[PDB]
Amino acid sequence: MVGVTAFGNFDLASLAIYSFWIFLAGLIYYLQTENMREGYPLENEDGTPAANQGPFPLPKPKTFILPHGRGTLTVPGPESEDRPIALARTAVSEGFPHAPTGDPMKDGVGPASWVARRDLPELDGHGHNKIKPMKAAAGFHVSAGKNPIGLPVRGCDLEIAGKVVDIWVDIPEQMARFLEVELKDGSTRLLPMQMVKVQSNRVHVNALSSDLFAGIPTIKSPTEVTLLEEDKICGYVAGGLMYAAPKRKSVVAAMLAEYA
Amino acid sequence: GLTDEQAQELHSVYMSGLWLFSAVAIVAHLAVYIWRPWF
Amino acid sequence: LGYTGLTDEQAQELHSVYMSGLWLFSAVAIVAHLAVYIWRPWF
Amino acid sequence: GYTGLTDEQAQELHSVYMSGLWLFSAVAIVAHLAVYIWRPWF
Amino acid sequence: TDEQAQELHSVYMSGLWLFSAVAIVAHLAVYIWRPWF
Amino acid sequence: EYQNIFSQVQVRGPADLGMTEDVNLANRSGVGPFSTLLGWFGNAQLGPIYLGSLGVLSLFSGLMWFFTIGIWFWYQAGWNPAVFLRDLFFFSLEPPAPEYGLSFAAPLKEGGLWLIASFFMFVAVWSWWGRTYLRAQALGMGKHTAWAFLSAIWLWMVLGFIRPILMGSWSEAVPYGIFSHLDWTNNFSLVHGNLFYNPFHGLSIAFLYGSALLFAMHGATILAVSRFGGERELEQIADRGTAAERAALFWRWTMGFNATMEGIHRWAIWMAVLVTLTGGIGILLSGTVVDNWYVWGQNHGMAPL
Amino acid sequence: MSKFYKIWMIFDPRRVFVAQGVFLFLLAVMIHLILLSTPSYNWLEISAAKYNRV
Amino acid sequence: MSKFYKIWMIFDPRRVFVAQGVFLFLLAVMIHLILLSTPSYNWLEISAAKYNRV
Amino acid sequence: MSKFYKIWMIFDPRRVFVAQGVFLFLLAVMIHLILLSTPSYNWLEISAAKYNRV
Amino acid sequence: MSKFYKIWMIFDPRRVFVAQGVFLFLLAVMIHLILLSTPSYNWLEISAAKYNRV
Amino acid sequence: MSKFYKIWMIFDPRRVFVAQGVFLFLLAVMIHLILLSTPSYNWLEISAAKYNRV
Amino acid sequence: MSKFYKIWMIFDPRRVFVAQGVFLFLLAVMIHLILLSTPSYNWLEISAAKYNRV
Amino acid sequence: DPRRVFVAQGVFLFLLAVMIHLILLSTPSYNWLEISAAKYNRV
Amino acid sequence: ALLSFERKYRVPGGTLVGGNLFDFWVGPFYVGFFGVATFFFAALGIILIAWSAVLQGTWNPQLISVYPPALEYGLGGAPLAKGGLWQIITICATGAFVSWALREVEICRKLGIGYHIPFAFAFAILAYLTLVLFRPVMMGAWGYAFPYGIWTHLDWVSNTGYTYGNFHYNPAHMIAISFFFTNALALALHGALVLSAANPEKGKEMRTPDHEDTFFRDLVGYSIGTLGIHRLGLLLSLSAVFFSALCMIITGTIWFDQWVDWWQWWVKLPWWANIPGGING
C-alpha cells in the first residue's frame, strides 16, 4: 500500500490526517459543551438573561446522585444566587466594576466572597465527619515539623491576636486543615492551614490584622464544621488580602505607598 | 456456595463440552496430518 | 488450622484428589518424554 | 510471638518443612550424581 | 526483653557458627583442589 | 508567604484500610509503614496493596521478563560484576536478524531470548490492564483508567507487535536496553526520512506539550484556590463553592472561556490520551504507507520544494 | 510425605491454584520456545527438511 | 478423576469460564501465527506455490 | 540445630514460603541458563554433535 | 562478645533477617560470577579443557 | 429469526442506530476508497481513458 | 450440549452480545486484510490480471 | 537515632569494601586470582 | 455576558499599574494596562508575520518562515527583508508573553487567589528566552535562534540536534524527557481517576475521595492524595521545562563534541576501565 494514491496526492496518510481533523473538531465541540454545565445561561449586569448566549448550545441535563442520602444534583438547571449582593454599579455601560456599598469583608463581595453552600458537615466514605478537632480525633498526633499548638498567632500588623488551642485534621487524608485560635476575649476562631506561616516562635498570618481577628465567622457546634461555615471563614480570611492592605505593616508596601 | 449436586451437574455438562471441543480438535489434527504431516 | 479454616478431614481429602491429579499429569508428561526421547534422544 | 504460633505448632511445622527439604535435597543429590557420571566437572 | 534477646542471640550465633563451619570446610576442599596463594 | 508546595506540619493516626464493597479483603495485604519523607509531599501511608489472581500473574510475568533480560546482560558481560556495572546501560537484547523474518527459528543467542522476553512482557502488560479494569469494577467506579491505559497499550503494541507483523520481520521491533532503544528510535527516524515531517508525529508532540501545559495550568490553579479548600474537587463538583467559581472566573477573564470542576478533567484525560493515540497511528503508517516523510511533506505543501 | 496435607492449613487453595496454573503455563511456553530456538528439535524445520518442503 | 467436580467448590464458574475463553482464543491465535511464520505450513504460501498462482 | 523451629516464631510461614518458592525457581532458571550458555554442558548442542543432527 | 545479644533490643529481627538473607545470596552470586569470569577458576572451562570438550 | 425483536429489549435504539449510521457510512467510504486505489475500478481513470480526456 | 443454556445464568446477555459483535467484526476485518495482503487471493489484483485491464 | 545511622553505615561499609576489592582486582597487580594462576602455572 | 455567579466578583482594585484607567472588561476578557500592551504586541507580531509572508512571496501558511539574521551579522541588526523582521517579531513576542503573565498577576490579585499560575508561565517564558535570547547571545549570533515557521523550526531542531550526533545521549535531556513522560502518565491517571469517581457505574452514587485512595492503593499500593497529585503535576511540568532549558543552555556552550563521548567518563573510571569483555572493551 506504499505509494498508492486514490486521487491527486491523496492516499492512506492523507485520509488519516483529514479524518483526524474532523474528529478533533467534534471532540472540541463535545468538550466545550460539557464545560457549559455550570454558570449558564449568561446574565446581564442587572440579572436578566443576555442577548448573546454563545455559539455552543447548552448540553442535555445530567444528574449526580450524592452519597449518604444527601440527594441528587441536576446540571445544567435553574441556578440562583440565593443571597443578596451588596454592590452598586459604578457606570451605566456594561463591563465596569461594581463598587461595594458597605463593608466588603462583611457583605461578602469581591475577593472576600462566599457561596451559599449546604449547611451540613462534610462526610467521609463511612459516614463520619471528614474534619475533626485533633483532641477529639482518637490516635492523632503531630508527627513531624514544628508543632504550632501553644504558639502565639501574629497578625499582619505585627501584633499578637491570640494563641493556638487545637488543630483540626482531615480524618481520611490525615492532613491538617484548620488551626483553632483563641483570642483575648476567650472565644476561639478557625484559620485555614494554607494561610499561616508556622515559624519557630509564632504562627504568622499575613492575611488579617489583629483587630480583624474578631470578625471571623464562628461555628455552631464545637466538634464539627459545615461546608457553609468553611466557605464563610475561608472567604473572609482570603479577602483580608485585599481589604486589609492599609493596616498591613509591610516595609515594601509602605515604600511603594510613599512612592505613589 | 455450590452444593455437591450442583457441582456434579455443572462438571458433567462442562466435561461434555470439553469432550466435544476435543473431538473437533482431534479430527482437525487428523486432517492436517494427512494433508501435511509434521513428523 | 486457623489460617484458612480447613479441618483435618477436608485437608486429607483435598490432598488426595490433588495428588491424584498431579500423578495423572506426571504420567502424561512421562509418556510424552518417552516418545520424544525415542524420536530424538538428547543424551 | 510476632505471628502467633505456639511451640508445638512451630515444632510440627518445622518437622514437616524439614521432611520436604530433605526430600528435595535427596532428589537434587541423585540428579547431581547422574550428571557427574555422565559428564564430570572436576 | 533481656532474656528474649539472650535466647534469640544464642540461637542466632549457633546458626552462624554452623554456617561458618560449612563455609570453612568448603574453602578447605577448594584450596586442596586449587589454591589461590 | 506560604505557597503550599510542602506541608509544614504532619499529623498521623490510625491507618486507613480503605473502602469495602464487592472487594475480597483477604487479597488486600497489610498496611505498610508510614514514610515521613513522602509525608512531606503527600500521604505518608504505604499500602495496603491488592494481590489478586491477575496481580500474581502480572508479577510473575514481569519478574520473568526482567530476570531474562538480566541474565542475558550477565552473559553479555562475561559474568563479570565489574563489567556488568561498567556496561549496564550499553547492553542489549536485540531482536532476531532480518534473515529469519518473522520466523521463530532464530537461535537462542541471536533472537530466541528476545522472543521469550517479549512473550513475558506481553503477558505482564495485558494482565496488568485486566487488573486495572477489575480493580475499578470492584469499587463500582467508571473504567476511565482502563481506557487511558488502553491508549498507552495501543502505542506499545504498535511499536513492538503489530508493525513488525505488517513489515514482515521481527527485526523491526525495539531491543531491550537503554541506549539500544535510544539508538533504535534514532535509526527509525533516519531510515524513514525526518520523522518530524510525519503529521501524526507532529500531532503527538502537540498533545505531549499540551499535556505538560494543561497539567501545569491545572496544578497551579488548584494550588492557588486550595486556600478555599479547592483540592476537594469531588465536593466542589457535588456542591460548587467559591473555589470553583474563583478558578473559573480567573480563566474566563484571562482567555475568554473556562471549564468546570469536572470538565477540566475531561480535557486532561483527552489531552493525555491523544498523545499515544496519534503516535500509534503515525508509527503504524511509517514504513507501511510512507517510506520517506520528507518527500511526502514536499508533495503535501509542507516542505519548500 | 503423609503429613503434606497440612500445607493446606497454611495456604488458601484459591491463591495457590491460580499461581500454580499461571506458573505451569508459563513454564510450558518457555520450554517449547527454547526447543523451537535450537536448529535441532525445532520440529517445524526438522520436518521441513525431512519431507523436502523447501 | 471422579472427585474433580469439587474444583467448583473452590472457584466461581464465572471467573473461571471468562479466563478459559480468553486463554483458549489467545492460544489458538498464537499457534496459528506460529504456523504462518514458517515458510512451510504457511498454508497461504504453500497453496500459492501448489497451483502456480504467481 | 534442634531449636531452629523457633524461626517460625519470628516469620509468618506464608511470606517465607512464597519467597522461598520464588527464590528456588529463580535460582534453578539461572543455573540452567548458565549451563546452556557455555559450549560445553550446553546439552542441546552436545547431543546435536553426538548424533550429527546438523 | 557476651553482650552482643543486646543488638536485638535495637533491631527488629524480621527486617534484620530479611536483609541478611538478601545480602548473603547477593554476595554469593557476586563471588561465583567473579570466579566464572577469570579464565582460571572458571571451573566450567577448566574441566572442559581437562577432558577435551571443545 | 422470529424472536430477533428481543434484541431491542437488550439495546437502547438510540445508541444502536447512531452506531449503525456511523458504521455504515465508514464502511461505504472505506470500500469506495479501496476501489479508487486500484488502477482498475478507479472509475475516474477508466473513463478518462475511455473518452481520451488526456 | 442441551444444558448450554445455563451459560446465560452466568453472563449478562448485554455484555456478551456487545463483545460478540465487536469480536466478530474484528475477526472478519482481520481475515479480509490477510487475504488482501497475499498476491494470490488479493481479489482486486487477481481480477485486474484476469480480464486484461493493465 | 541508632536505626537510620546503622542502616546507612552497613550499606556504606559494604559498598566501600566492594569498591576497594574491585579496585584491587582491576589492576594487573593485586589481582590475586590472576597472579596465583601465573604463579602455579595454571594457564 | 456574565456567568450566573460572576456579578459578585467584579470589583475595583487589585491592579499593579494604572489605577482604574484600564480596570474594565471587554466582553469576558479583562483588559487592564498589561492587557492593552498584550493586545498591541500580539496584533503587531501577527501583522508582521503576514507582511513577511508577502515579502517571501508565498501565501501558504505552512511555508511562511521568518528566518533570523545570518551568522555574518553577528549580534547586530539586519535589514528588515533579510533578518530585521525576525528581530522585531521576537521583541513583540517577548513583550506579549511578559505582559500576559503580568495581566494574569492582576487577575489573581482581583480574585484573591494565589500567584502560582503566572509563576508557572514564567518557566515557559524562560525556556523560550533560552532558545531565542540566552543561547544565541552566549554563542555569538542571532543565526542560532530558530525561524518562525510551522515546519521550518523543525528544521532548526533537526540540524541543531544532529550537530552533536545522536542528541539522545544528553543527560540533562534524558532527565527532561523522563519528566515529560511521567507528566503525561500522571495527567492521564489523574483525569481518569477523578472522572471515574465523579461518573461511577450507571445508577450508582457519586464516589468519594476515600474510594479514589482505595483504588490506587489496591492498584499499586500507594496513594498520593489530591493535594499531593496537584503538587506533583506542577512540579513535574516545571521540572521538565527547567531541565530542557538546562540541556539547551549547556549544548554548544560548554560541550562541543558528540554527546556519547560524555558518557565515556563512566566507562573510564579507574576500577573497571581496563577489564576486558563486555560492550566497551
Ligand SMILES: CCCCCCCCCCCCCCCCCC(=O)OC[C@H](COP(=O)([O-])OCC(O)COP(=O)([O-])OC[C@@H](COC(=O)CCCCCCCCCCCCCCCCC)OC(=O)CCCCCCCCCCCCCCCCC)OC(=O)CCCCCCCCCCCCCCCCC
Ligand atoms: C458518520 C460521521 C462520523 C463523524 C464523527 C464526528 C464527531 C467525532 C467526535 C465524536 C465524539 C468525541 C468523543 C467523545 C468523548 C466522550 C465519549 C465517552 O467516552 O463516553 C461518553 C458517554 C460516557 O462517558 P462518561 O459520562 O464519562 O462515563 C459515565 C459512565 O457511566 C461510566 O463510564 P464508562 O465505564 O461507561 O466508560 C466511559 C468511557 C470513558 O472513556 C473516556 O472518557 C476516555 C477515552 C480515551 C480513549 C479510549 C481508548 C483509546 C483507544 C486507542 C486505540 C484503540 C486501541 C485498541 C487496541 C489496543 C491494542 C491493539 O469509556 C468507554 O467505554 C468509551 C469507549 C472507549 C473504549 C474504546 C476502545 C476501542 C476503540 C476502537 C476505535 C474505533 C472507534 C470505536 C468507538 C468505541 C465506542 C464504544 O457515553 C455513554 O454514555 C456510553 C458508554 C460508551 C460510549 C462510547 C462513546 C465513544 C468514546 C470513545 C471514542 C473514541 C474511541 C478511540 C478511538 C479514536 C479514533 C480516532
Ligand code: BCL
Ligand atoms: C531522532 C529521533 C526522532 C524521534 C523518534 C521517535 C520515534 C521513532 C517515536 C517517537 C515518539 C514520540 N516522540 Mg519523537 N523523535 C524525535 C524528536 C522528538 C521531539 C523533539 C523536540 O525533537 C519530541 C518532543 C518528541 C516527542 C515524542 C513523543 C510525543 C512521542 C512518544 C509518546 C510517548 O509517550 O511515548 C512513550 C510511551 C510509551 C512507550 C507507552 C508505554 C506503555 C506500556 C504499557 C508501558 C509498559 C511498561 C513496562 C511493563 C515496564 C514497567 C516496569 C515497572 C512496572 C515500572 N520527539 C526525532 C525526530 N519519536 C513515538 C511516537 O509515537 O511517534 C509518533 C515513537 O515511536
Ligand SMILES: COC(C)(C)C/C=C/C(C)=C/C=C/C(C)=C/C=C/C(C)=C/C=C/C=C(C)/C=C/C=C(\C)CC/C=C(\C)CCC=C(C)C
Ligand atoms: C510453540 O508451541 C506452543 C508454545 C505454541 C505450544 C504450547 C502449548 C501449551 C503450552 C498450551 C497448553 C494447552 C492446554 C493446557 C489447554 C487445554 C485446555 C482444555 C481445558 C480445553 C477446555 C475446554 C472447555 C470447553 C470449552 C468447555 C466449555 C463449556 C461448555 C460450553 C458447557 C458449559 C455450561 C456450564 C457448565 C453450565 C452449567 C451450569 C450449572 C447450573 C449446571
Ligand SMILES: COC(C)(C)C/C=C/C(C)=C/C=C/C(C)=C/C=C/C(C)=C/C=C\C=C(C)\C=C\C=C(/C)CC/C=C(\C)CCC=C(C)C
Ligand atoms: C542484578 O539484577 C539482575 C541482573 C538479577 C536483574 C536485573 C536486570 C536488569 C539488567 C534488566 C534490564 C532490563 C532493561 C534495562 C529494560 C529495558 C526495556 C526497554 C527500554 C523497553 C523498550 C521498548 C519495549 C518494546 C516496545 C516492547 C514491546 C513489547 C511487544 C509489544 C510484545 C511483543 C510480543 C511478541 C513479540 C511475542 C512473540 C513470541 C511469542 C511466543 C508469540
Ligand SMILES: [Fe+2]
Ligand atoms: Fe484535578
